[PDB]
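ligand=calcium ion
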Amino acid sequence: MRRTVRYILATSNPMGDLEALEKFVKLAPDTGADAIALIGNLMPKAAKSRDYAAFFRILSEAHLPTAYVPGPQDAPIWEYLREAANVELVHPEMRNVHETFTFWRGPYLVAGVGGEIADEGEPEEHEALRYPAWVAEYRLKALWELKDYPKIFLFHTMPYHKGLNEQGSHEVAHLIKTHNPLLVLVAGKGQKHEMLGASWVVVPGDLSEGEYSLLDLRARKLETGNVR
Amino acid sequence: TVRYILATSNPMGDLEALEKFVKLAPDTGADAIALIGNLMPKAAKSRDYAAFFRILSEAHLPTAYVPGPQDAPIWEYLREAANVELVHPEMRNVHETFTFWRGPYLVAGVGGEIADEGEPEEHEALRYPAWVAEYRLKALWELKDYPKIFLFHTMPYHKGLNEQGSHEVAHLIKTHNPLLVLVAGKGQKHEMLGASWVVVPGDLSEGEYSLLDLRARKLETGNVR
Amino acid sequence: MRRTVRYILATSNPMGDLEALEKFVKLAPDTGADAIALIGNLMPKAAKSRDYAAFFRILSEAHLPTAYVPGPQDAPIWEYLREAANVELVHPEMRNVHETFTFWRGPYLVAGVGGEIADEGEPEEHEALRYPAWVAEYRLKALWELKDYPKIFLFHTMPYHKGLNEQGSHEVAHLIKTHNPLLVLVAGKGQKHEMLGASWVVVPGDLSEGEYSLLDLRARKLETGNVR
Amino acid sequence: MRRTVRYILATSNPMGDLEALEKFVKLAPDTGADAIALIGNLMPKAAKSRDYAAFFRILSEAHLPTAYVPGPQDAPIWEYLREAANVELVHPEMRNVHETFTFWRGPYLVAGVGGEIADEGEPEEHEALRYPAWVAEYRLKALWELKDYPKIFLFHTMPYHKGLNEQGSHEVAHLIKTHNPLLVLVAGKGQKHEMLGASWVVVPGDLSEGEYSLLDLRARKLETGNVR
Amino acid sequence: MRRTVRYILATSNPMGDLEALEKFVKLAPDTGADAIALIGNLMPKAAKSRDYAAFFRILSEAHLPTAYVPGPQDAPIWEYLREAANVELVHPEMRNVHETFTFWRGPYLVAGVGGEIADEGEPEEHEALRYPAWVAEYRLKALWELKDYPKIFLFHTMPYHKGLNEQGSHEVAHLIKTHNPLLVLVAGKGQKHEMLGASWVVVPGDLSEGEYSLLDLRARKLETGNVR
Amino acid sequence: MRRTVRYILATSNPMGDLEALEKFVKLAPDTGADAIALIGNLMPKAAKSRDYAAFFRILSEAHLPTAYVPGPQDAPIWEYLREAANVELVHPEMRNVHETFTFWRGPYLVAGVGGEIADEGEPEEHEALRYPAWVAEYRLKALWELKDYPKIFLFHTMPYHKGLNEQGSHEVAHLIKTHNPLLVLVAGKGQKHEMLGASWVVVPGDLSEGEYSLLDLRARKLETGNVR
Amino acid sequence: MRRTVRYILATSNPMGDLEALEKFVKLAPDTGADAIALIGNLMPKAAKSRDYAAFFRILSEAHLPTAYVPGPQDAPIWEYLREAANVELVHPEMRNVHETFTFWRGPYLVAGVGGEIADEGEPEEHEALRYPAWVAEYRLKALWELKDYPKIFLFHTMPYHKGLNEQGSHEVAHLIKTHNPLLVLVAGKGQKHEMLGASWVVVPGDLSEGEYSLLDLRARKLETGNVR
Amino acid sequence: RTVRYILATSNPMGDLEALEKFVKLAPDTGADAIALIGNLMPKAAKSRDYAAFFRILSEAHLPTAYVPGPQDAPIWEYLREAANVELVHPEMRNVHETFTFWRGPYLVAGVGGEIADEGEPEEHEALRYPAWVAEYRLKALWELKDYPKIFLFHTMPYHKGLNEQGSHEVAHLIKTHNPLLVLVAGKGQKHEMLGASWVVVPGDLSEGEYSLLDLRARKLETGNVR
Ligand SMILES: [Ca+2]
Ligand SMILES: [Ca+2]
Ligand SMILES: [Ca+2]
Ligand SMILES: [Ca+2]
Ligand SMILES: [Ca+2]
Ligand SMILES: [Ca+2]
Ligand SMILES: [Ca+2]
Ligand SMILES: [Ca+2]
Ligand SMILES: [Ca+2]
Ligand SMILES: [Ca+2]
Ligand SMILES: [Ca+2]
Ligand SMILES: [Ca+2]
Ligand SMILES: [Ca+2]
Ligand SMILES: [Ca+2]
C-alpha cells in the first residue's frame, strides 16, 4: 500500500512537549509526508518510562514509516529503549535507529547515532547519553556490509560546517564524509539546510519551539512550518 | 482510518442474525467488519455461501473474513467469496492471504482448524497442521512495516486464562505481534496476550457480536436477539 | 551483501533428474547469475517427500535468491509444500512462490501459480495439480494491494500468443495483460521468448532435456545452454 | 577462500587463558578451517582493556574471518568494545557481532547476542553483561531487514531443549525458532551438538578446559579436539 | 552482473551534445552492455562546471560500470575533475580513469590517459589538455604494480598503425606495445577496429555525430549503431 | 582486486582433451579457487600451434593466476612456447613457468621444469622434451638469488618416494630436498599426496582421466573431483 | 636480493641543502635502513629543473627502495615530475608517490599526496603546489581497489592531532581516519611521533636542520639522528 | 663494494691468448666485475674448448657475466661447460635467458645469440632467436622491477649514432626495460645514450679491444692487449 519515500516530515528536541507533538502528528496527513524522522531530546532528563510510553503512543497515530534517535538527556538508555521496543512491536513502521538501521521504500538505508557524540572521553548512558567518536564510528561501520543503498543518517550532534555551525563536530563531519549519506538530519533550532560534500544536511527545526520541516528528498527542497 | 470494528464469529447459517448484524453497522459507527467462521454448517452448499455473502455485502464497509472448521470443501467457500468480491471490492476473504484497511493495517488470517500436527484436510473439513499456518504467515515478513490484524478460528494458549488454547497459534501471535487478533468463540471478551490484543467477538449463532475500539483496546458488547 | 537482480538463471520441468539439477546449480557461479527461477515439474508424479527433500538440498547449494512453482505432476500438493517449507526455514533466500509472493532486489515482485491452469473444471491437488482459471486469477488479485512494483511471474501453463502458442491459455494471457508483469517464465522445451503486450514471456527450456537459459532482464535478451 | 564457508573452527570461554588461545590459533591452519567463531567469556571480569588487546592480538594471528560475542564476565562492556573496535581497524576480517552482524562467504549472515540473556530484570553492562530477553529479541529483529540469507547465530546463553538441556533458556529457544538460523553456537563445556527444530545447535567446547571443535556445516557434524 | 565483462557500450567526443547522450544512455539497457566506456571531448572548451555536472547526471542514469577520460578541450582540468569526483561520490560505478585506474568484473584493469598526448612540448591543463609523451608513459608505468590483469586502455589520441593510420602517434603505439592491453578505445569518427600487435584497437565512433559501438570482448568484433 | 592464494585448482596431462579442460576451467568459480596449476602433457605430440592456441583460449577464460609447464610430448618446444607467449601478452595472469618463475600473492615464488627430467643423456626439444638432471638443477639455481620466499614447483617428472612412486626420479627428489619447496605438483594418475621432508608433494590427478584436485595450501590437504 | 622492509630512514624539507642530502644518503648503510621516505620541500621555490636533477642524482646513490612527495614550494609541478621521471627510468627502486603508489616488500602499499593540502580553494601547481582537500581525497580513493594491504602514507601537510598539533589539518586527519594506514609520515621540525587511531603518525625531522629518523616499522618506535 | 667499474669485451672467437691477457688486466685496472659477450668460440669449437675458455675466465675471481654469440652452437655444449665452471666458481654466471645480481644491487640479464626480427629459433646449427623469444625472456624481469638493470646482448640495437643497421626489436627491448647499462658486441670501443639507457660497445677482443666502464660517470676507458 505504501509507496517510495519522497517527502519526510521532521523535527527535533520536543523535550516532553506532548501537545506540540500531537499537533506535529496531526499535520502529517495533509502535508503529504511519506515518513517522519525525529531527533531527540524526546524528553528532559527527569522523565521516566511512562513519559516515553505516552510520547510514543502519541507518535504512533501517524501510521507512517517513522525513525528516531534519542538525545543527550534521554537517559538512562534502557527506559527509552524499552518503550521504543514496546511500541515498535505492534507498530513496526516505527523504528528507533540508534546504533542500528532500517530500510524505507526507495530504497533508502536509514541509520543513526543519538545522544551527544563527544570527541573523546568515556561513554555514558545513565546520567546522560554520551558517546565518544570511536563508538559512533563503530556503529556505522556495520553499514559497509550493505551494498549500493543511498543513506539517511539521524544525529543529534551537529557536523562542523562553515555555513551551518563552525562549532560543530569534526568527528561527525568525518562520519558524513566517509559514508556520503544522501541526507543527514540533526538537532537544531531554526530550520536551516546546507550541502556538506555530496550530503544534504538539514536542521529540521526544534519542536519545543514549534518548528518542523517537510523535506523533498528528490528535489532536496525544504518546506518549513510551525505548530504555535 | 479504521478505528471501530463490528465483529462476530460462527454464524453457522443463521441468515436472519446476519441481516440484523449487518443492519447494525450504521448505528454502531463501524468503520469495518470482521467475521470468522463457521460461516456455514458443514452440510451447506455453494448456493448457501452466495446468499450469505449477498447479505454481508449490504453493509458496504471494508469487510474481512476467514472460514471455520466445517466450511468445507474449501473450494465452495472460495468460489463464492471470489464471486461476491468481483462485485464488492470492499469484501475480502483473508484466509491464507491479506489485504489492507484504512490506516493502513495489514489484515491477514488462517481459518479452519489449526491443529498441532497431522495431515491437512480441505474437503471433509478445514484442518491445517501448525506448519502450514506458519508457512502462510511468513509471507507477511515481506510487508513487515504495517501494524497487523489477524483473523483465526482457533484460539491461542493463554496461561491462567485459557489453558485449552493452542500453543502453536500463540507462537504465531508472539512471532508477528499483531496489534489485534480476532478468534472464534461464544461470549464476548478480550485479553492482552503479550503485546497483542486478542478478542473473542462473540458467537453470532447465539446473537452475540462486539464493536471493537482499536484505539482504546476496548469493546461494546451487543446481541441481535 | 547481495546486489540488484539483472541475470536470472532459469529452466523448467527437471522431472526428478538430480544429476541435471546439480549441474544446473553449478553453473550459477560461472555465469554470475543473480538469481534462479525454476518451473516444474520438479518431480515425476510418482515422487514422494524424500525425493523432494533431495531435490531442494541440491538446489540450496546455490546460495542465491531462488523462486519456484510446481507442475501438474507435483502432487499431492502437501508433499511439495512441506519439503519447500523445510528447506526454506534455514535457506530463506529460497521461495516457493506458488499462490504467494516475495521481493527480489531491484525491486521485483515475484509471484506465481504453478500446476495446470485449466479453463474451468474442478480444482485438484491430490492426483495432480490443476486449477480452474478463476482460482489462478483469485491468487494474483492480492498483488493489486502492492503499489508500483515491476512484477515477475512464474507459471507452468503457457499463455495464448500468436508467436509462442496459438493454443496457449487465453485466461493466462489475460492475467499477463492485466498485471503487465515485466517478465513471465513458463514451462516448455526449447528456449524461446516473445513480447506479450508489455511483458517479456520466456520459455527457459526443459532441464529434463538438459536445457536452461540465462536471462538478461534489462535487455530482454536470453543466452541459451545445455548441461550436456 | 572457498566460495562457501564450510569448516568453522570454534570454541568458547577461554577465560583469560592466553596460552590456550595461542595454541588454538596455532593449529587453525592445519584444520583447514574457513572461519572461526568464538564465544565468551574472553576474559575474567577483573581483566582490563590491555588484557583484551593482548587477547585480540593473538586471535588476529589466525588470519581468518573471525566472529565473536562477549560472555557474562566481559564487563564493563566498553573495554571489550573498545579493543574489538581497535583490532578490527587493523584486521577487517575480525568481527565482534554482539548486537550487530557481518557476512561470511556463502553468503551467510552471522549475528549474535553475547552476555547472559536473562528472562527479565534489568540490563547490566558494568558489573557484568546481562540482558533480559526483550533486549536480545530487539537486537535480532533488525535481521528481518536482511531476511534472504541463511543465518549463523552466536550466543553465550544456551536455549531450552526438551530432553537435553532442561535448564536452558526458553527465550533463547524462542529466538531460534523465530529466526531459524542454520547454525547456532553457544557456550559450554564438552563438545556436542543437537538439532533444535531446523537449527543445528553446537556447544563447541570450553577452551579454558583446552576444548575446541571443527564444524562441518555441510554434514552438520563436528570433529573434536583439545590443545592440551 | 555477469562475472566477466563481455559487452561494452562505447563512444567518444559527444562534445556537449546532451541530447545524443540521453539517447545513448536510454539505449544502453537494450544493448545488454555489461559496461560503458566514453572518451572525450565530453564538452567544448567553452563549457564550464555546471555543464559537466549535467553531463555526468545524464551518464549516471545508465546504472552501469562506466569509465571515461577527457579530451583536448575538457579544460581547465580541475572542472572536469571536480565534477567527476562529485558524481562518483554518489554513483560509485562511475569512474574517471584519467591518469588512474579501476577494475571491471573479470577482473579487468581499466586505465587511461585523456587529453592530447603530444610527441613533446610542455604540459597544458588550462587552455587545453595536452600531455607530452613522457608524462603519459609515467602515468601508465604505475600499472606494472598490477601486473596480473588483462588491461583495457582509454586514450583520446590514436596510435600509429602502419598502413591504416600513419598520422597516428608512435608514442601511443609504443605504450600499447609495452603494456599489451587486451582492448584499446580511442577517439575518432567512423566505427572501426584493427589488431595492433596483440591489442584490439577500437574507434567506437563519434557521438556528436550520433555514432556508438557495442563491443564483444570475447569475439573481438563490434556492433555499430547511431542515435540518429 | 586479487587476494592471497590459499586454494589451488590443479591437474595434469590433459592430452588435448578440450572438453575436459573447459569443464575444469568452469570449476574454478564454483570452488573459489585462487589459482590454477596445470602440468603437461597439455597436448599429444601430434598437436601443432593452432591446437595450443585453442587450449590457451579456453584456459584464459578462468581469469585467475595460472601456472603451467609442458610435458614430454609438448614438442617441438617452440610451438608450446609461442602460443603461451601469445595468450600471456594480453592475459598476463597466465604463465608458463618452464625454466622460469613468477610470484603469486602470499607471497609464493612459482617455478618449474617441464618435460621429462632424465637422470642423464642429451637434451631434446624437437622429437620430445627431455632434459638431463643437471639442466633442471641449472634452471632452479637461479632462484637462490631470490630471498625468503616460500616456493611452489611444477614438474612433470615424479620424484622417487616410497609412498608415491618407488620408481620415481632420485634427482628430482634431490632438487626438492635442496630447494625445500613448500608445494611440489607433479603429473600422474590418481590424486594423492605425501610429504618429502618439509615439502608437500601432490599428484593432482590426470585430466585425461577426468581427475583434478583443489589443494588447501595452509592445511596441506586436498579435495578430490572428476569432471565426468 | 632485497628483503622485507622493516627499517625506514626518513626525513623532510631538505630545501635544496644538497650537502646535507649527501650526508643523509651516506648514512643509509650505517643505519641498516631497508628503505627511505622523504617529504618535501625537496627544493625552495626558486630552484629549477637542473636543481632537481642534481638532487635526484645524489638520492639515487642510496640504492634502496625510496619514496617521496613534493612540498608546497616544489613548483611548477612539471619540473619536479620530469626530473623524477628521468631518474626513475633507470633507478626503478626510486618512486615519487604523489598521487599514485608503489609496493614495498612486506607487502606495504606506499602512497602519497604532496604539496599543501588546504581545506578548500582552487588547485595550484605553478606558483606553488596547493590542493584542496577534495583533491587529496580523490587521489587516495583509488587505493580501495587494492585489497588487504597495510598502507604507508606520505603527506607534507600534518593532520589535526591534540598531541603533535592542534593547528593540523582536520581533512588530512580524515584521510588517515578513513584509510587507517599503518604509518603516516609528515613534514615537520623535531623528530616526534604519536598514534592517531590505529595509525602511527611520524614527524621524522627537518633535513635542512640536519634532522632524520630511522623507523622500526614493527615496533612502531624510532631512533633520532642529525647529520651536522 | 658496490659495482662501479666493469671490464668488458666481446667476440674473442676462441682467442684464448687474448682472453688470458684480458683477464690479467683486471687487477691493475681496479675492475669490480667483468662482462663478456660472444662469440666465445667459433662454431667448430666443441665442449673441451669451452672448458678451456671458462678456466681462464674463472681466474679473474670477480663477479663475471656472459652470454653466447650466434656461433656458440649447439647451445647445450656452451650451457654444460658454463654449468660446470659455475658449480666451482660462484662469481661466474651465464646470464643468457636468465639473471643474477651484482653488488649494488644491479639486476644483470641477457639474451645472447642472434636476435632476428622473425623466423624460427635455432640452437643447433647456430644460435638464433626471433624477437618474440628475446622479449619473452626479458618479461620475467617485471617480477623484479625495482632494480637498476645491466643488459648483455650480442645483437646491437638500432640507433642513428652507433648503428643504422641495428635491430629495432632490440632497441624496443631497451626502451621497454630502461636498463641502466647495455653491453653489445661489435668492433671499435664506443658508446651513446639510447633514451635513458647507456649503450656500450666494449670492443672485439679478437682484435685485442676491451673497455673499462665507469658506471657512475657513464664513461669509457679503452685499451688493447695486442
Ligand atoms: Ca530519565
Ligand atoms: Ca548498548
Ligand atoms: Ca459444505
Ligand atoms: Ca507424488
Ligand atoms: Ca490451498
Ligand atoms: Ca578464493
Ligand atoms: Ca573487566
Ligand atoms: Ca551477478
Ligand atoms: Ca571549459
Ligand atoms: Ca595533475
Ligand atoms: Ca607437436
Ligand atoms: Ca621552482
Ligand atoms: Ca660448436
Ligand atoms: Ca632453451
